Design a protein around this ligand. Structure first.
Ligand SMILES: Nc1ncnc2c1ncn2[C@@H]1O[C@H](COP(=O)(O)OP(=O)(O)O)[C@@H](O)[C@H]1O
Ligand code: ALF
Ligand SMILES: [Mg+2]
Lengths: 50, 452, 593, 453
């Protein structure tokens, strides 16, 4: 029962903390990179007009 | 007819040496082969005027071409004969019926409702769906959207509402303006076949815009429907319902034209003025003081990545009062329609509930059903994480109630029109499972009167 | 001149694009000058000037305007009319009267090119002077008052720029246009009226600012207890869609101890504005009998309305909020919502072809917001009287997807000291107001704690800190319950989660539409928090004596209900709450034995 | 002669272009006489042919072009330096705001300053006792050092700055610190609190201050910090004083330069900020240190609020590449009532090795210091494991550490904003936190230092 409980909380943390923290992390990472390159090419069009 | 074409760059076009060209003026270009393409003045400066042709600028000879300025923005010919007809994105006849004789010509942009002349939503409009009519009541003049996803049966629910919507204790004063925005041909004939067989075409005004139609015709399609909707509601006094889908395809067509004109992209590539542009469409709904009829809008949009923080569903939630969520867990279970009432909300349902707008028990039953589901789902979750032995005897009852709630109350069928009476009666029958001591949100009065 | 006659400078339009219009032959005009544009005569504002050409920020829709149409300037900046007849009326971004709008245009909709004064220039107000002839006066001194409402006295002041002695003054019934007093200044004699103009982009002058140390009674328990806003403070309410940003403002616009509220409908829903002019005329104060509409001026520029007018609506409201602040009144300014003003600047920035900063918004967004919130605060108004006026800023922020990392929320947090961070998960669980007690904060809680402790003559700051200590321990405990289990919690820790549960659904939750909970007096909050705290105080006394966890819970079932209904105890029966404290001890003593 | 032209070309936002001019120098202070009599100062940003582009500090609000004039002064923006500046209140441009007599300037120095010769420089090894154990022991502050305090929106950054200037002194000496403060776009409530603390201390008279609040125009914020560092080095190297510099908020300063960077249509860099931000911040931070042969010294304690609480933001990132270390305030430590909420793991001081040791503070400071961080890092690493995998799951050796980091935050770091603990009381406290762990786990302290303590 003690080893069952160690594994149980091991499993629980992964589903409720580690994996969700990553899933939300990946969302924010990919979000930033796209708008950054989206806004980066935007000024390059403005600089091309100079 | 001016023939001074100066430049033709992509979808844009410049016309020099003009006099009196106004902003947002609809133009008419006559090419070297006699073919006619319509455009729109995006900007006018000095004797120059930059326009964008709807169909594009492919195969245009700037030398021998001529442009005619109509002197008016994009308009719509409105009349009483639009009921039962089908128009395209630009309001042109598609059913090949008789020629329409317009009574007046209105700007597709229209005019803003004066906030002092605006009337608050009143009474209620039957949606024939238990999850709407009771838990998330639709009110005359309310902006209540339906959030869906690619694969979810939001087309069936849209057709279900468009043939089951009506006004109680009122006769022959209700119409449905169905506007399709950038859909496939097979999805278009879905509604075409359903509207005619169910007879709902006889009381509906339909505007169809396909996916292969010009992207400017996609962003001008909902404006055509609302202009005809405001004509039937404010000048003819009809309770007009406006169903629109898809709004995502409108957002894509709006970002396509924005990239075509090289505007500064906002969040997720979409135009920064997306909230403003969406608001010019959703704020058309509402009631007017001393004016019979009402304009009610039911937006239907698919959430990309099933994400609610996306600019399309998020910014829509900032305009519309509430939303109707369609989840995947309920759709896989066979619930028709798969409406999750936990994330859904109707902010004007108070002006729809109560006696004479609904059954006196409406407000009391609604709130007790909600709390019983929320606790029931919560108990159903406890049975998977911690097993069935960690829940008390009262917990298994709420978990059993949530099963019947999703399978009998919500799951009614896309072709099953309930009434407000049958909906409330079905809800009262479900409350008898829970003890009278657990119905802590309904007063002893309505309990002794309706509980079986 | 021209053709045998001459007149004022007439422009001609050379460029029309969306809300931005450029016209030539305008050299006599200046920056920030209003001007009628086109044959229609729509309102605009000069923002940029190149040689004779001016760049106009038009506040109306420009569809159907082209080059060749003339442009006429006014010579004055973007200003507002300040005098009797301003209260109990709602205005657009440019402060036009919407009720007068419909009457003139004779249409339920909004036309264009409609010229209308802000105030009613032909209404007869009986003026009542308060100063003697020959008294030296400056800007701020009072020369008379006019009872605008039943309890609001519109004290006529000396306009800015005039300094001298009162030559002749007399009471009587007059309009806002005819002179009521004559001042013998150093530059000659001047005729003053009850109406004065002031530019909205420049804040009204004061003597000096004061530290806001007077906590405002909002009636909301999650606010006045843990995250208090001071009279003159700045509070931002950023939250996702449908999280309760407006509802919080409607409660503050109706249960605040302020002399005047200024509600700015900046880019919000049109139904959200009609609901105001209908419910507020019915919200009667049971003491004075005057309706809430009698105590409030609201400005409305909805979302579908002109985009540039969103900026005008913000500066119009805070200027009116400053006009009544100088009378020694405590004015509250409501901005619903500031996120739509920021879109108008980003929209304008994209038209001006300016370099975008963060997420497309212009680089000067930090200053424009800082320029606004600093115009608030508890001030020493002008004049010899040294009177204390204040402006309390309650602005709502609407971030995309509820992400507060967006620009306008961060720039707001820098210049304000109160952050009412709304949460979407709380709004889904019907937890209202949806104020996140973990993320929200108030930099005034320490000073409010000193003030609050004194009036109560009780260690109230130590009760709020202890109640906060239980709620922060609940967050740390919930992470273990989801990991290990609630049955794995000790008797003392499981008690903490139950006491924290009482803090949540009995004290923090407040229904907006229920009469018993919608307002909670300061004395009622103390009795409620003391009863909840006395529960855990004697419960840990029992656990340390040998009692079990479930033994205390099952033996206190009847008492635990009386606390959950304590929010519905009327103010005239507050003895019921405090009696539960003594009642708990009696019930606990038998349980121990 | 009086160089003044009346041929304005265009006015766009804070920028302005004058044509048909001659003899206009770069970085030249100007004045704008309008059609109503108002005067607004400005500086020249570009001079080509007969044209001159200038930036108006107070902004161009209500300016008629045909009836206005531009008065070129022929010199860069200067500050009237004098010893009578002590205890005075100047605005963000330099005009006195305390309603007192006008200063009779002993000199007029360019606000841009001058570069100190590195051979003429003197390496700062002096020790400053700040009364804070998290600074005096962990990230030692020295006289003439570039040590900023990184904070966020709402964090008690203003409480920590008053604590340091109240308790700062040097060992075996009685010299006082000539504090120089500069407000950059902050709110009135922050500035007033700082004023009341300075009054309470009794050092208000010693301090010289420049004030730019939030309601002030943002364009002039570009010159306000250059006002202070010109007056700071004036009192240090020329008057022979030990000058301390504390500035806030530096975040609003960078926002001001981006406004002009955006108005000038320049080539942007990271997040729209100008590409020369590392250089522009360097013109301000490198105005610090000691000069051989002069008894003066310039110590800098900058303060900035990290936008979005992100260290990788260009403002706190480039600051770290210029300044010697940093002091980071986290919202997590302030969340727990830790006063001051100093996170000493990411913080660092780079001039301390020469400022500690026998004769300066304590013989064993370096060995304890090194031993502290390593054990705190692992103790914090173990606590972050206890809250996830459980208390019992943690190793017993790590569990002793889990309590090591708990007491090292509530007792060691948490000391209050009014506690002046001595360096002897700070280092003795540190050993008491190391006596918990067994002697075998203290591997970065030698046996000689382990035995004596
Ligand atoms: N304090 C409250 N009490 C009761 N209900 C609330 C409260 N705040 C919000 N709500 C509910 O949330 C809905 C949306 O609130 P609102 O303030 O309009 O959201 P937003 O954040 O979009 O302004 C309301 O219709 C109301 O039913
Ligand atoms: F309803 Al909202 F912000 F989403 F006002
Ligand atoms: Mg709202």
């Amino acid at each position: 029962a003690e080893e069952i409980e160690k594994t149980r909380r091991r499993v629980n943390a992964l589903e409720y903390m580690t994996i969700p923290q990553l899933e939300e992390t990946i969302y924010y990472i990919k979000m930033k990179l796209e708008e950054n390159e989206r806004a980066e090419v935007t000024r390059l069009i403005k600089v091309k007009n100079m | 007819e001016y023939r001074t074409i100066k430049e033709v760059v992509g979808p844009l076009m410049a016309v020099e040496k003009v006099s009196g060209v106004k902003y947002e003026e609809l133009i008419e270009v006559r090419m070297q082969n006699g073919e006619i393409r319509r455009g729109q003045v995006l900007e006018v400066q000095e004797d120059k005027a930059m326009v964008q042709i709807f169909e594009g600028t492919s195969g245009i000879n700037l030398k021998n071409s001529s442009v005619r300025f109509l002197g008016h923005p994009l308009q719509l010919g409105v009349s009483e004969d639009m009921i039962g007809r089908v128009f395209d994105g630009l309001g042109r006849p598609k059913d090949n019926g008789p020629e329409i004789l317009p009574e007046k010509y209105l700007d597709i942009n229209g005019e803003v409702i004066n906030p002092i002349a605006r009337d608050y939503p009143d009474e209620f409009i039957q949606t024939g769906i238990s999850a709407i009519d009771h838990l998330n009541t639709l009110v005359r003049g309310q902006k209540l959207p339906v959030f869906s996803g690619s694969g979810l049966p939001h087309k069936e629910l849209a057709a279900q509402i468009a043939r089951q919507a009506t006004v109680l204790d009122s006769s022959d004063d209700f119409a449905v303006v169905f506007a399709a925005i950038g859909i496939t041909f097979e999805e278009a004939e879905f509604f075409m076949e359903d509207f005619r067989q169910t007879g709902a075409i006889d009381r509906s005004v339909m505007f169809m815009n396909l996916a292969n139609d010009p992207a400017i015709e996609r962003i001008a399609t909902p404006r055509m429907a609302l202009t005809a909707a405001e004509y039937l509601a404010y000048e003819k006094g009809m309770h007009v319902l406006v169903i629109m889908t898809d709004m995502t395809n409108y957002a894509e067509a709006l970002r396509e034209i924005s990239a075509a004109r090289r505007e500064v992209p906002g969040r997720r590539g979409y135009p920064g003025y997306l909230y403003t542009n969406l608001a010019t469409l959703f704020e058309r709904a509402g009631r007017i003081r001393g004016l019979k009829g009402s304009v009610t809008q039911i937006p239907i949009l698919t959430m990309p990545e099933d994400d609610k923080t996306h600019p399309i569903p998020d910014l829509t939630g900032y305009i519309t009062e509430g939303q109707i969520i369609l989840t995947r867990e309920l759709y896989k279970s066979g619930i028709q329609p798969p409406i999750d009432v936990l994330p859904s909300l109707s902010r004007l349902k108070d002006k729809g509930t109560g006696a004479g707008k609904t059954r006196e028990d409406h407000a009391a039953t609604m709130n007790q059903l909600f709390a019983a589901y929320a606790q029931g789902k919560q108990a159903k979750e406890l049975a998977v994480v911690l097993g069935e032995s960690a829940l008390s005897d009262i917990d298994k009852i709420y978990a059993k109630f949530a099963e019947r709630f999703e399978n009998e109350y919500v799951n009614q069928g896309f072709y099953t029109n309930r009434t407000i009476t049958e909906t409330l009666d079905l809800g009262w029958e479900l409350l008898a499972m829970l003890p009278r001591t657990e119905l802590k949100r309904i007063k002893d009065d309505l309990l002794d009167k309706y509980l079986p | 001149g021209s053709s045998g006659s001459s007149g004022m400078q007439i422009g001609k339009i050379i460029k029309v694009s969306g809300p931005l219009v450029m016209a030539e032959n305008m050299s006599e005009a200046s920056i920030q000058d209003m001007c009628l544009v086109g044959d229609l005569g729509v309102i605009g504002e000069i923002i940029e000037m190149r040689q004779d050409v001016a760049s106009i920020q038009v506040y109306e829709e420009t569809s159907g305007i082209g080059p060749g149409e003339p442009v006429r300037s006014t010579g004055e900046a973007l200003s507002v009319e300040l005098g009797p007849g301003i209260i109990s009326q709602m205005f657009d971004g440019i402060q036009r009267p919407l009720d007068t709008f419909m009457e003139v245009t004779q249409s339920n909709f909004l036309g264009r090119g409609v010229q209308l004064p802000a105030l009613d220039h032909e209404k007869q107000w009986w003026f009542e002077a308060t100063i003697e002839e020959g008294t030296e006066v400056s800007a701020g001194d009072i020369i008379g008052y006019v009872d605008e409402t039943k309890i609001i006295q519109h004290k006529i002041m000396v306009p800015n720029g005039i300094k001298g002695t009162v030559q002749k003054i007399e009471s009587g019934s007059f309009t806002i246009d005819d002179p009521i007093c004559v001042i013998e200044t150093e530059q000659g004699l001047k005729e003053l009226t009850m109406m004065q103009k002031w530019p909205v982009r420049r804040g009204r002058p004061i003597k000096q600012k004061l530290n806001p140390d007077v906590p405002m009674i909002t009636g909301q328990r999650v606010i006045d207890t843990f995250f208090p806003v001071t009279k003159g403070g700045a509070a931002a309410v950023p939250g996702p869609f449908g999280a309760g940003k407006t509802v919080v403002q409607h409660q503050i616009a109706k249960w605040s101890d302020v002399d005047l509220v200024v509600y700015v409908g900046c880019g919000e829903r049109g139904n959200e504005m009609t609901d105001v002019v209908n419910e507020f005329p019915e919200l009667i104060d049971p003491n004075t009998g005057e309706s809430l509409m009698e105590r409030t001026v609201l400005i409305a520029n909805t979302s579908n309305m002109p985009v540039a007018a969103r900026e005008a609506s913000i500066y119009t409201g805070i200027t009116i909020a400053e006009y009544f602040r100088d009378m020694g009144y405590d004015v509250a300014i409501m901005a619903d919502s500031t996120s739509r003003w920021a879109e108008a600047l980003r929209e304008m920035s994209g038209r001006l072809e300016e370099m975008p900063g963060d997420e497309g918004y212009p680089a000067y967004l930090g200053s424009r917001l800082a320029e606004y919130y600093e115009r608030s605060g508890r001030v020493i108004a002008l004049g010899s009287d040294q009177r204390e006026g204040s402006i309390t800023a309650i602005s709502a922020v609407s971030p995309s997807g509820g992400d507060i990392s967006e620009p306008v929320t961060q720039n707001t947090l820098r210049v304000v000291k109160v952050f009412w961070g709304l949460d979407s998960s709380l709004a889904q669980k019907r937890h209202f107001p949806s104020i996140n007690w973990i993320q929200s904060y108030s930099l005034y809680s320490t000073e409010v704690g000193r003030y609050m402790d004194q009036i109560l003559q009780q260690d109230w700051s130590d009760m709020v800190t202890e109640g906060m200590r239980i709620l922060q321990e609940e967050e740390q405990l919930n992470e273990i319950v989801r990991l290990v289990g609630i049955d794995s919690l000790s008797d003392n820790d499981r008690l903490t989660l139950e006491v924290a549960k009482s803090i949540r659904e009995d004290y923090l939750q407040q229904n907006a539409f229920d009469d018993v909970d919608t307002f909670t007096s300061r004395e009622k909050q103390f009795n409620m928090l003391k009863v909840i705290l006395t529960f855990g105080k004697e419960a840990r006394k029992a656990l340390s004596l040998g009692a079990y966890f479930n033994e205390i819970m099952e033996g206190t079932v009847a008492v635990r209900e009386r606390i959950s209904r304590s929010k519905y105890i009327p103010e005239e029966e507050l003895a019921k709450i405090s009696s539960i404290n003594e009642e708990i001890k009696e019930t606990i003593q038998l349980i121990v034995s």
